[PDB]
Structure formats: structure tokens, C-alpha cells
Design an enzyme around this catalytic site. Structure first.
Site, mmCIF file in Angstrom:
data_model
loop_
_atom_site.group_PDB
_atom_site.id
_atom_site.type_symbol
_atom_site.label_atom_id
_atom_site.label_comp_id
_atom_site.label_asym_id
_atom_site.label_seq_id
_atom_site.Cartn_x
_atom_site.Cartn_y
_atom_site.Cartn_z
ATOM 1 N N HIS A 80 85.169 17.318 58.779
ATOM 2 C CA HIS A 80 86.060 15.622 58.498
ATOM 3 C C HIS A 80 84.819 15.547 59.904
ATOM 4 O O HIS A 80 84.314 14.589 59.727
ATOM 5 C CB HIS A 80 86.255 15.062 58.100
ATOM 6 C CG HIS A 80 87.892 14.997 59.241
ATOM 7 N ND1 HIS A 80 89.109 15.512 59.530
ATOM 8 C CD2 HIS A 80 87.777 13.530 60.079
ATOM 9 C CE1 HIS A 80 88.955 14.764 60.374
ATOM 10 N NE2 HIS A 80 88.485 13.922 61.045
ATOM 11 N N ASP B 233 90.275 20.851 54.943
ATOM 12 C CA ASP B 233 89.691 20.244 56.230
ATOM 13 C C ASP B 233 89.481 21.522 57.326
ATOM 14 O O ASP B 233 90.800 20.858 58.852
ATOM 15 C CB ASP B 233 90.352 19.054 56.702
ATOM 16 C CG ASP B 233 89.698 18.236 57.355
ATOM 17 O OD1 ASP B 233 87.885 18.353 58.190
ATOM 18 O OD2 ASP B 233 90.083 17.022 58.202
ATOM 19 N N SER C 198 91.261 14.153 65.148
ATOM 20 C CA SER C 198 90.866 15.333 64.717
ATOM 21 C C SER C 198 90.339 16.617 64.920
ATOM 22 O O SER C 198 89.420 15.840 66.316
ATOM 23 C CB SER C 198 90.080 14.376 63.903
ATOM 24 O OG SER C 198 90.074 13.071 63.649
ATOM 25 N N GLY C 199 90.715 16.980 64.398
ATOM 26 C CA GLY C 199 90.640 18.750 64.828
ATOM 27 C C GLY C 199 90.932 19.940 66.603
ATOM 28 O O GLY C 199 90.431 20.312 66.179
#
Ligand SMILES: *[C@@H]1O[C@H](CO)[C@@H](O[C@@H]2O[C@H](CO)[C@@H](O[C@@H]3O[C@H](CO[C@H]4O[C@H](CO)[C@@H](O)[C@H](O)[C@@H]4O)[C@@H](O)[C@H](O[C@H]4O[C@H](CO)[C@@H](O)[C@H](O)[C@@H]4O)[C@@H]3O)[C@H](O)[C@H]2NC(C)=O)[C@H](O)[C@H]1NC(C)=O
Ligand SMILES: [Ca+2]
Lengths: 131, 226, 239, 216
Positions: free
Chosen positions: C41, C90, C186-187
Site C-alpha cells: 500500500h 500487502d 507501514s512497511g
């Protein structure tokens, strides 16, 4: 049987047989893996249709490096040694030192025991340490 | 491909004289009016003088009237600024510029030129009684005690301005900070040039600062290491 | 990271800060000198193009990530089965134009092996420059916190995520909240120690708010994605 | 004759629109064409506007000029501001015999606060051989420009024996850098052990000190 990149399906006997059958190559590019927290080298056998540890028999760094390349680690190689099997396996893959220039998983055949009484533990990269 | 290249800037004593020149190329020199504009260190632009296409008309700022003379040699594609009775407040970078914005006036039968469309490189004039002095170049060596290290060169005790510093003969530009020179109480200048590099590069990559002080014909390539 | 503490140099040497237009956007985890694992994402259009992205390794402070010093990204690969609406699968890979130089501050984390035999509530760590409270700003410094795995069956309870957690997903954190990943993480990595080795178990994916009760963090199940990762790595090796 | 007055400074964020004014002291602004020159630090000027609102070839349409009769002023407007636009801007006009410049406006691009990276450098052995010691403290890529360097020698605060130099705004990340030099004779330098640079800045939660021990 099912390839990934496409919805393609193939016969289980064609999984990890040295010949490309999936359009995306899925059947012939994940035939080598490292099992468990002790990095037991395993190879998918198209005959038994299962994963099996690799005998330490005749193994050396040249073979470990070739397994690492096949897994996608290119020129990386960290360490390897023979260990006693903790994966709970009944059968193994033995090295054919006269197999020629084929992929690693195609240089191994089925054997109910290893002459060196040990299986290959292999680490392709120095990872997982801090401080 | 229109280019203007000045020359003749130098250190000169109060009361002395100098002649600047500007070589023009890439256009018909006799087709444009030309001008000199100067800039004292840290100050703004100040028009000095301009000259018509064929040198018939000239104009001067009040600050240089009776001391400076502008002229041109259209057969040599060259503009000149002759300066007499120089004084400390004439210390400045002198820019040659083409005053290419103009219009023809029918009633006065002449071109009126009022704006600059191309600028030169500048040449520095320093009016002072002090003597030329070449700098010493000392290493600013990285502390052996992560990720980003810093190293540089200290260019100390020189006169007059300027000194230029490059790193690795122009290959290294990222992370370079060449600071404005400070004037020390001794009347000499001193500046630092630094560059930030990855610490993992220290042992492998070579870092050379190329120091140039043309007034003293000083050329120094100092290699810096921890 | 909510409810954590600032990280020391070398504590999480696989953590990277991924930048677009000279600002932190997402986190990632080093797995080889060239390959970084992040979340799909983060690289949705128009950020699917590699030339937008630079990675910063071995640096704790965003102020110290100088423009022009980050490693330029050469390739960006989202998982082919990534669904942006549901965030299923994701995960994404980022390949650098130049290989990293490993040291005491920059090291890779290990990809998980089959047969890890992790405990149901395995003790894990999360790290990143995410906000330290929901709807806050990017953190200046790298933070880290300890979280526990939450069994997917419990995470799919009607009181938690109500059947939203897929086999490509794992939950980690606390049902009482207070400690969680957050916007900006995120990530980044979800890691655990087993057999004295640090393993990448998850990549920070999604959640309802940050550190809210009954709303733990959701992470891509890296174990489920290792086949795809190895394939992208091996295909690139055939340059 | 007349003067042209510009603001000393003007600031705006990237992507936004900024206007710089240039007011003529006597006579109408529309009586003589207005030019605008951009000058980046340490570079020659370049023309961005001429004849009040014309653009030289190669100048992007983000640059525009105009004139306002009521305020007797000319204005340079930059839309979609970029970091490469940080520079000094000069307006220029003329009477029957003079070329007249405004005093210049420094355009600063606004950005987020950035803490300085601090480095200290002992004097080189080569310099000490000459009798003088220069201790250099480097503050790298910070914002805003305001920073305080305090030199300490064996924890004694120094005053009067240092000089500072600061770079202009960086063309790519909009930060500043600062170099402070502490000067002492070699004889005085060898009378002390701990040399410390203490930095105060908006981006630092508490002062950052970098130090070395002479000889260690
Ligand atoms: C380790 O790896 C080596 C290297 O591959 C293996 O050695 C090969 O083993 C295969 C299978 O046993 C051999 O294939 C058989 O060869 C017979 C001999 O003729 C071959 O070789 C000559 C060489 O001059 C060629 O001209 C000829 O074309 C053949 O290739 C053949 O007679 C066999 O074919 C017959 O039997 C098979 C069934 O086995 C039938 O399907 C055929 O129709 C036919 O009737 C067969 O081709 C091969 O020759 C070996 N190569 C070498 C270089 O020795 C080892 O077996 C392997 N070891 C272990 C333990 O795995
Ligand atoms: Ca096959």
C-alpha cells in the site's frame, strides 16, 4: 499443480522436474528451501511429492553456494555444516557427484539413509544479529 | 552560444589604475550596447557605465565619474573598463553585460538601450595596500570515533580574495559545503570547505580538496584521511 | 510506534526509512544488500515508479537523512495478488540501484523459514518513524516497542476484526491497546527472536486507529510470501 | 532620477505563489521599463523578466512581471515555487542617464525544522608546527538559520576568540550550514585538555556537545 502467475495448473509429477512447465516458472524456481530455526536444507522430490532433507554425503561449499543461488541469494554464502536431523523426516536426498551441470535439486536422488549420518544445515546470508 | 568573458581583475593599491576587458562571442558585437555592473562583497548590484553600439555615447554613475573610462574595440569583439584613482570602495566583482534591450527613437535618430539580457562571469577587483599572501591548507580530518562522517580542508591566512575549492577534481559535488571566507583580525582571510560522506566509504574512497588561490599562483591538492 | 521508546544505534540495523520528495513515507526491512521488504500500500500509483523512492539505512534521525545521500531505488514490485481495498497480500519489494554496505548499523534480517514453531502469543518487536499517537506526525527519531502475536482466530472475533484477518495477515499488539504501530510505520518490520536469530515475521500493514482497545495492528504474513520473494530475487539474479 | 525600494526578505513554501515588489521613489513606475534579475549565491545574475512583463527565452512561465500604478510599484511573481528559486532578486529601471537597481530581495524557501549534524575537528599537527591552533566545529544541514555555538575549554566558556561563517540556503534541501573556528596559540592550546563545541538550535531538545581530549 496450480501455477501462480497464471491460473495454470500442471501435473504434480511436473513440479521440480528440471523442465519448465509453468509460464511463470513457479514449478522449477522454489525447489530448494531452508527448514526450521536450524536451517535444514530441503529439496522437493517430484517422485515422493514431498520435501526431504539433503544428506551431508559428499556435500561441500560448492554445493551449498549453488543451493543459495537457486534460492535467489546470488553470490551470498554464510555457513554450512552437517547436523543430525530434527525435522522428523524418514527419507532423504543424496548427492550424485556425477550428475553434470544441472540445477541442485536435480543432482539429488532418494535414499533411505545418509552414509555420513547427517543432513545439511545451510545459511546463505549473515542475517538476524543486532548490537 | 552568446558568451561574455571578463579578465583583468587584480589586487591594486589605493590611487592605482587597472584595465578590465570583456571578450564577447556568439553574436555580432557591434549590434549591441554594452555595460559594466559591479557588486561589492555582500552588497547589491551597482551600475558603473555603459556604451553605445559604436562607442559614440557613454554614460557613467556619479560614483565613478572623472575616474573611469568605458570603451570598446568592435574589430576585436572586446569591451574595456579603464579605472584610474582607484579607492577601497571600488572593491567589487565587476560584471560585463550586454545591454540588449533597446528601442529606436525616430525623433532623436538613435537607439536607447536600457536593460541587460546576457551577463558575464565577473572579475574581482580588490583595492588595498595589503600584500598578496598565499594560504596554507590544513586537513579537517574525520573523527575516528555513525553512517555519516565529515571531512574537509582549512584554507588559512591568504590575501586577497578569492580561493576556489573543488573535491576530487570536480567529481565530488554532493554534500560539499564551501563556506564564505572570514576576515581575521590579522587582515588575512580564512575559509573551510567540508563534505559529508558515508563512514563506510572512509577506508575505500580517496578525498582530495583542490585549493586554488590564483593571486599567489597557489595550487594545492590535499588528501584528507582519518 | 505508540507506547515504545527511542532506539539505539545498531538495535534494528535492518530498519530503513523510505523517502519520496525528501520526506519519510514508509518503513522497510533489509533482507539483502539490494533488497528491501515493504508494504504494497506504500507503492500504490503514482508511487509505483522506482525513481520516486530513496532508502536511508543506519540513521536514527530524519534530520540526518540528507537529500542526495539516500540509496536510489531501482525496482518496485508489488505482490501480484495485492488488493488495495481489503489490503490482502500487502507486501512489496524494493531493489536498490547500488548495494548497501553492511556494518554495525546496517545489517539484514533473516527471512522466516517453514517450521518456525512460533508460540501462539510469540513475543515480537516493531519499529519505525510512525506517529507516537494516532493522527500524530512522523516521529523525528526511530522508535521500537514489544508486542505479542494474537492468534488469528481470536483476532477474527466479532469484538476485534470480525473475520477480516486472512491467511496472508497476522495480528500483533494488545487487545487492551496502548502499544501499537501507527501511521508512518507501514512497511516496517515485525520481528521475533528464536534460536538467537532475528526473523522477519511481518510487515506493518493496517489497523483501525493506533493503540485502540480491541484494534491491534495487522501485518502481512511474511511466511506466506517467502516463495514470491525468493522468486523475485532469483529472477533479478538472472540479469 | 529616482530610487527603487524592495523588501529585504521574502519567504514562501514550495509549490505556492510569491510576489516581490519594487517601488519607485519619484516619477511613475510606468514611465520606464522594469527588468528583474535573479542571482543565486556566488553566481552571475540572469535575466528573468524584461519590459515589465516579458520573459527571456528559456525562463519558465512560473515567472511573471507586472506594474501597479496606484502603489507606483513593479512586481515579480513566482508561481509553483521551487527550491532552485532561492536567490536574491533585483529589479532594475532607468532614467535619461542612469541605470537604477533596487536593493535586492532575498527569497527564502520555508521548510520543516532540521536539527544540525555537529562535528568537531582538532587542529592538524601540520598547523601546530606553525605556532597557531585552529579548532573547527561544523554544523551541517540545519533549519532555520538561527544557531548558537558555544566553545568550552576545560569547561571554561570562551568569548572573543572565535569566528563564524554560514552558507546560504541549500538549493536542494533548503538547509543552512555553519562553520565556527576557535583560534588559540599552540602554547595556549597545549595548556588544556578538553575542547568542546556546544550547539543550541530549535531542532535540538537539549544542547548537543561534541568534544575531544587533546592528544587522545
Ligand atoms: C548420476 O548421474 C549420472 C549422469 O546422468 C547418471 O548416469 C546416467 O544414467 C542414465 C540412467 O541410468 C543413463 O541412461 C541410460 O544409458 C544407457 C546407455 O546408453 C546411454 O549412453 C550412451 C553413451 O554413449 C548414449 O550413446 C546413449 O544414447 C545413452 O544415453 C541407455 O542404454 C539407456 O537407455 C535404455 O534404457 C532406458 C531405461 O533405463 C530406456 O528408457 C531407453 O529406451 C533404453 O532402452 C539410458 O539412456 C545414462 O547413460 C547415464 N549417463 C552417464 C554419463 O553415465 C547416473 O545414473 C546417476 N546416478 C545415480 C545413482 O543417480
Ligand atoms: Ca517442471
Amino acid at each position: 499443480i496450480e501455477c501462480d502467475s497464471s491460473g495454470t495448473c500442471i501435473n504434480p509429477s511436473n513440479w521440480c522436474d528440471g523442465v519448465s512447465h509453468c509460464p511463470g516458472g513457479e514449478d522449477e524456481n522454489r525447489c530448494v528451501r531452508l527448514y526450521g530455526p536450524n536451517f535444514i536444507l530441503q529439496v522437493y522430490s517430484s517422485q515422493r511429492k514431498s520435501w526431504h532433507p539433503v544428506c551431508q554425503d559428499d556435500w561441500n561449499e560448492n554445493y551449498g553456494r549453488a543451493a543459495c543461488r537457486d534460492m535467489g541469494y546470488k553470490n551470498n554464502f554464510y555457513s554450512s555444516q552437517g547436523i543430525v536431523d530434527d525435522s522428523g523426516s524418514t527419507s532423504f536426498m543424496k548427492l550424485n557427484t556425477s550428475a553434470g551441470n544441472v540445477d541442485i535439486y536435480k543432482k539429488l536422488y532418494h535414499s533411505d539413509a545418509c552414509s555420513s549420518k547427517a543432513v545439511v544445515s545451510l545459511r546463505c546470508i549473515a542475517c538476524g544479529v543486532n548490537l | 552560444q552568446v558568451q561574455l568573458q571578463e579578465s583583468g581583475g587584480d589586487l591594486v593599491q589605493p590611487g592605482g589604475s587597472l584595465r578590465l576587458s570583456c571578450a564577447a562571442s556568439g553574436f555580432t558585437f557591434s549590434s549591441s550596447a554594452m555595460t559594466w555592473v559591479r557588486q561589492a562583497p555582500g552588497k547589491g548590484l551597482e551600475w558603473v557605465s555603459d556604451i553605445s553600439r559604436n562607442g559614440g555615447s557613454t554614460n557613467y554613475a556619479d560614483s565613478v565619474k572623472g575616474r573611469f573610462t568605458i570603451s570598446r574595440d568592435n574589430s576585436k569583439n572586446t569591451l574595456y573598463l579603464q579605472m584610474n584613482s582607484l579607492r577601497a570602495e571600488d572593491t567589487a566583482v565587476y560584471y560585463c553585460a550586454r545591454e540588449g534591450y533597446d528601442f529606436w527613437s525616430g525623433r532623436e535618430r538613435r537607439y536607447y538601450y536600457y536593460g541587460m539580457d546576457v551577463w558575464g562571469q565577473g572579475t574581482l577587483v580588490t583595492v588595498s595596500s595589503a600584500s598578496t599572501k598565499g594560504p596554507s591548507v590544513f586537513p579537517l580530518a574525520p573523527s575516528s570515533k555513525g553512517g555519516t562522517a565529515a571531512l574537509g580542508c582549512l584554507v588559512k591566512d591568504y590575501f586577497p580574495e578569492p580561493v576556489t575549492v573543488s573535491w576530487n577534481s570536480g567529481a565530488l559535488t554532493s554534500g560539499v559545503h564551501t563556506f564564505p571566507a572570514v576576515l581575521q583580525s590579522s587582515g588575512l582571510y580564512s575559509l573551510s570547505s567540508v563534505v559529508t560522506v558515508p563512514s563506510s566509504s572512509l577506508g575505500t574512497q580517496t578525498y582530495i580538496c583542490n585549493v586554488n588561490h590564483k593571486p599567489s599562483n597557489t595550487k594545492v591538492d590535499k588528501k584528507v584521511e582519518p | 510506534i505508540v507506547g515504545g521508546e527511542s532506539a539505539l544505534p545498531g538495535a534494528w540495523p535492518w530498519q530503513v526509512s523510505l523517502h519520496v520528495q525528501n520526506v519519510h513515507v514508509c518503513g522497510g526491512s533489509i533482507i539483502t544488500p539490494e533488497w528491501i521488504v515493504t508494504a504494497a500500500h506504500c507503492v500504490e500509483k503514482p508511487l509505483n515508479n522506482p525513481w520516486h523512492w530513496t532508502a536511508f539505512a543506519g540513521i536514527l534521525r530524519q534530520s540526518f537523512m540528507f537529500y542526495g545521500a539516500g540509496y536510489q531505488v531501482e525496482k518496485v514490485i508489488s505482490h501480484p495478488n495485492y488488493d488495495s481495498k481489503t489490503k490482502n497480500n500487502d507486501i512489496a519489494l524494493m531493489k536498490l540501484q547500488k548495494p548497501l554496505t553492511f556494518n554495525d548499523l546496517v545489517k539484514p534480517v533473516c527471512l522466516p523459514n517453514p517450521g518456525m514453531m512460533l508460540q501462539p502469543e510469540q513475543l515480537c518487536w516493531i519499529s519505525g518513524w510512525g506517529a507516537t499517537e494516532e493522527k500524530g506526525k512522523t516521529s523525528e527519531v526511530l522508535n521500537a516497542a514489544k508486542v505479542l502475536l494474537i492468534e488469528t482466530q481470536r483476532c477474527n472475533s466479532r469484538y476485534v476484526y470480525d473475520n477480516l484477518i486472512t491467511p496472508a495477515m497476522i495480528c500483533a499488539g494488545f487487545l487492551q491497546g496502548n502499544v501499537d504501530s501507527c501511521q508512518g510505520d507501514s512497511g516496517g518490520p515485525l520481528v521475533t527472536s528464536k534460536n538467537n536469530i532475528w526473523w522477519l515475521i511481518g510487515d506493518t500493514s493496517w489497523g483501525s486507529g493506533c493503540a485502540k482497545a480491541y484494534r491491534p495492528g495487522v501485518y502481512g504474513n511474511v511466511m506466506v510470501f517467502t516463495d514470491w520473494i525468493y522468486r523475485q530475487m532469483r529472477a533479478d539474479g538472472e540479469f | 532620477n529616482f530610487m527603487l525600494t524592495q523588501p529585504h526578505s521574502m519567504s514562501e513554501s514550495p509549490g505556492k505563489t510569491v510576489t516581490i515588489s519594487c517601488t519607485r521613489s519619484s516619477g511613475s513606475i510606468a514611465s520606464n521599463y522594469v527588468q528583474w534579475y535573479q542571482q543565486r549565491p556566488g553566481s552571475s545574475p540572469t535575466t528573468v523578466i524584461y519590459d515589465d512583463n516579458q520573459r527571456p527565452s528559456g525562463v519558465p512561465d512560473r515567472f511573471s512581471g507586472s506594474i501597479d500604478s496606484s502603489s507606483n510599484s513593479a512586481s515579480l511573481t513566482i508561481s509553483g515555487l521551487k527550491t532552485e528559486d532561492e536567490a536574491d532578486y533585483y529589479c532594475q529601471s532607468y532614467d535619461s542617464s542612469n541605470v537604477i537597481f533596487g536593493g535586492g530581495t532575498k527569497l527564502t524557501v520555508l521548510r520543516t525544522v532540521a536539527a544540525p549534524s555537529v562535528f568537531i575537528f582538532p587542529p592538524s599537527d601540520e598547523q601546530l608546527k606553525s605556532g597557531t591552533a585552529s579548532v573547527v566545529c561544523l554544523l551541517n544541514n540545519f533549519y532555520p538559520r538561527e544557531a548558537k555555538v558555544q566553545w568550552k575549554v576545560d569547561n571554561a566558556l570562551q568569548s572573543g576568540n572565535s569566528q563564524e561563517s554560514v552558507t546560504e540556503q541549500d538549493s536542494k534541501d533548503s538547509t543552512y550550514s555553519l562553520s565556527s573556528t576557535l583560534t588559540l596559540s599552540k602554547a595556549d592550546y597545549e595548556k588544556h585538555k578538553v575542547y568542546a563545541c556546544e550547539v543550541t538550535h530549535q531542532g535540538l531538545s537539549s544542547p548537543v556537545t561534541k568534544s575531544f581530549n587533546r592528544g587522545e
